Amino acid sequence: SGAIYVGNYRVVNRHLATHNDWANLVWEDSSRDLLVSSTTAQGCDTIARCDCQTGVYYCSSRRKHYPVSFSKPSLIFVEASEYYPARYQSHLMLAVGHSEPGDCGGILRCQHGVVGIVSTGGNGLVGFADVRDLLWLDEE
Binding-site residues for Zn(2+): 50, 52, 110, 112
Stretch that binds Zn ion, among 17-25, 26-34, 42-50, 88-96 (CB under 5 A): 42-50
In angstroms, how far is CA 26 from the centroid of its own chain? 16
| Of the residues 84, 90, 110, 112, which one makes contact with ligand A1BQ2 according to CB under 6 A | 84
Does 37 help bind ligand A1BQ2 (rule: CB under 6 A)?
no
Q: Residue 22 carries which side chain, given as an amino acid letter?
A: W
x/- map, 117-136, ligand A1BQ2, by CB under 6 A: -xxxxx---x----------
Give the separation between CA 50 and CA 34, rounded to whole angstroms: 20
Give the separation between CA 67 and CA 109, rounded to whole angstroms: 9
Catalytic site residue 33?
A: yes
Give the list of residues 6+ apart from residue 96 with CB closer than 8 angstroms, or none.
Answer: 68, 69, 124, 125
- Give 62-108 as a DSSP string: GTEEEEEE-PPPEEEEE---SSS-SEEEEEEEEEE----GGGTTPEE
Catalytic site residue 65?
A: no
**Nearer CB in complex with ligand A1BQ2: 24/81:** 81
Question: Annotated active-site positions, please?
Answer: 15, 33, 104
- Give contact residues for ligand A1BQ2 (rule: CB under 6 A): 15, 33, 78, 81, 83-84, 89, 99-101, 103-104, 118-122, 126
